Amino acid sequence: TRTVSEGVAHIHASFNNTIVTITDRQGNALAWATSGGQGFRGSRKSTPFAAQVAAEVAGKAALDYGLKNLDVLVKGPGPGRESAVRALGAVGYKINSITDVTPIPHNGCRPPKKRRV
Amino acid sequence: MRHYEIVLLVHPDQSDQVVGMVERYISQIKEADGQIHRLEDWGRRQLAYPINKIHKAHYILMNVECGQSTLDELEELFRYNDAIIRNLIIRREHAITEESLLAK
Amino acid sequence: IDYKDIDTLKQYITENGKIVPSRITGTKARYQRQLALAIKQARYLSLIPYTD
Amino acid sequence: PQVKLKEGEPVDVAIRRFKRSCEKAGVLADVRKREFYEKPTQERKRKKAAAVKRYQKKLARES
Amino acid sequence: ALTNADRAEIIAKFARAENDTGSPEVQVALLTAQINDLQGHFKAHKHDHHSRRGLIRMVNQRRKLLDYLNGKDHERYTALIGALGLRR
RNA sequence: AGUAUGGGAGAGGAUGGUAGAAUUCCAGGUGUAGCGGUGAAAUGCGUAGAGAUCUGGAGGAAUACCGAUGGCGAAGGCAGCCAUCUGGCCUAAUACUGACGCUGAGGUACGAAAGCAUGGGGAGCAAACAGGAUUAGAUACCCUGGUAGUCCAUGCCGUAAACGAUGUCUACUAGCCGUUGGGGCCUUUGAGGCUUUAGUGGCGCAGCUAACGCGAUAAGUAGACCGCCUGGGGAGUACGGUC
Ligand SMILES: NCCC[C@H](N)CC(=O)NCCC[C@H](N)CC(=O)NCCC[C@H](N)CC(=O)N[C@@H]1[C@H](O)[C@@H](OC(N)=O)[C@@H](CO)O[C@H]1NC1=N[C@@H]2C(=O)NC[C@@H](O)[C@H]2N1
């Protein structure tokens, strides 16, 4: 029902899963989609193809509110951070900027122990 | 007596009151003894990052010479004055009197 | 070098705000240490950002 | 980063340019570094090996 | 900590000739002054072992100089320990 | 061998204050079916509204980039920034004392991590422990949780592949290339090029070594003092003693 013009797309990319959240400015959510929401359960949630599918679903959902231009913020490593932006551009929003916002400690907490696989 | 350089960041709401405080501290240093070697007002400047949800600040530089006790009293005053949000005290050798780059 | 000379300070800072190593800038070691101290002092005084 | 988009730039050149900027910054290497805890013994060993490699590379490129 | 004026005053008090700075009397007097001064510091900072090593070195150096002076001339040694208020 | 005076570099030590990033928890806003995890899963969290995103609080621990065969310290070790107290080292020239030295059985001081005592604190991590997997079994490696501990104050313990597996001090014996802190000289204007000194590295003649290798930071040539070894197990064990 609500109408906004500008938007932001947060791509939480992770070694296990990618979450796309399309939000208005000042960060109130409008649409969201993940790989598990389209399938690819378990180990397949981390493929760029799954990331692309999630991104297109989220963009098509947000078009109902109706947005022309969005800024893309990517957070985390893992497959699909580029693929999701590809899918958004394919859907047809105009991308104002793409910035990486992965957080870095200045030596904060101690990480978990190393895996002996 | 040792030499010190003081940088004060005062809230923009107290931009008018900054003058009274500066003469207050200068008078205290002079009553102790001391010599004010440099005094500069950089005016109001935009912060590189917000401090206490504030984006502007009034900048003051002082180059003073003082004993130990007066340094402690100045530190206490800076601690308990709410107008000052940040301060930097750096011990220095010699005395500095030249015009700073940032004052312009 | 003093922390007030932000014009010289920005020359040794990347876009995101990190300190540029002497390996790249060709700076001598003593100058590099003085420069790092000045940059940290300026960051504390909010003359330049910690990040971005 | 903050890779703003010109009107002429398509999404593909946008992605390539942003990826180049991310490679320049090196955030992903930091994330992989802080994924798990590295003990001081191993850290010092790795840095010493890196120093040996750097010196050998310098000598090789000198002669 | 002692200042240049304090050290100069001690040297003037204990010198045996003009410009004499290396005599056992001058060296022991300076060491005694420094050792007595540091006792205040080590009262406040009981766990400054790294600094306490230097104080131990000063004590050892004073003992060596005192033994040398006693070997050379017993009268000067007696006068010096009496002036400085040292047990031995 | 030591002292006085000028100058210099440093994560050397102790006390207090403060800054920014991140994790966790909490309260709201928008929002709606998943999230998390793995080799693949399951345990687990979620419509009692999770995860994601924005805002605001609480608290603890650690200080990205600089950062480096870099630096400082007797060794153990030491890393944001600021002040206070404090040790040693380097460097120049005078002056001063006049062998005041080296080593060191007993002795004494310091001494990573884990552990212990009393009182606080507790974010993250994580012995023990619980559950889910894998397996012929799994008492493990992997996953989800998680107490002691890790942190602070005041004491104890006195051990590590506490390593350069190389005791301390001194003198002498081709050279070449780096790097850190200083001194001097030369061009000539801003930067370079020669030397010397104290550290820290890479090669290498002679010499040495069973060989690998060491080679002015010796494992070479010699001197002073100390510690230690005498086939492999039994055994750094039993008994006695000290703590
Ligand atoms: N005056 C006071 C000064 C005090 C200060 N301490 C300076 C000093 O006095 N130093 C003395 C020099 C002794 C030297 N360290 C002995 C040595 O070097 N090996 C010991 C004997 C092993 C064998 N005979 C040769 C060997 O296997 N070599 C390997 C090899 O070449 C290569 O390894 C692989 N995988 O091929 C390389 C890189 O991995 O490592 C070497 N091995 C190592 N390199 C390390 C290193 O230098 N140190 C610490 C430790 O880590 C060392 N081991």
What is the compact description of this entry?
Chain B has 104 residues and is of the alpha+beta class. Helices cover 27% and strands 39% of the residues of chain B. Chain B has helices at residues 18-32, 68-80; strands spanning 2-10, 35-46, 56-66, 84-92.
Set out the fold topology:
This is part of a larger assembly, with chains A (117 residues), B (104 residues), C (52 residues), D (63 residues) and E (88 residues).
Chain A: E1 6-14, E2 17-23, E3 29-34, H1 35-38, H2 48-62, E4 69-75, H3 81-91, E5 94-100
Parallel strand pairs in A: 1-4, 4-5
Antiparallel strand pairs in A: 1-2, 2-3
Helix pairs in contact in A: 2-3
Chain D: E1 3-4, H1 11-25, H2 27-34, H3 40-62
Chain E: H1 4-14, H2 24-44, H3 49-72, H4 74-84
Chain E binds one RNA strand of 243 nucleotides through residues 1, 4, 7-8, 11, 15-17, 19-24, 26-27, 30, 38, 40-42, 44-57, 61, 64-65, 67-69, 71-72.
PDB class: ribosome/rna
Keywords: Antibiotic, Ribosome-RNA complex
Entry title: A. baumannii ribosome-Streptothricin-D complex: 70S with P-site tRNA
Quickly count the helices of chain C: 3
Rg of chain C, please?
A: 10 Å
Give the overall silhouette of chain A: globular
Instruction: Kindly state the percentage of residues in helix of chain A.
Output: 25-40%
Lateral strand order in the biggest sheet of chain A? 3-2-1-4-5
Biggest sheet overview of chain C: none
DSSP helical segment count of chain A:
3
Give the class of chain A from helix and strand content and strand pairing: alpha/beta
* Number of discrete domains of chain C: 1
Beta percentage of chain A is 25-35%
- The tally of beta strands of chain C, per DSSP, is 0
What structural class should be given to the helix and strand makeup of chain C? mainly alpha
Largest interface: A-D, 24 and 24 residues
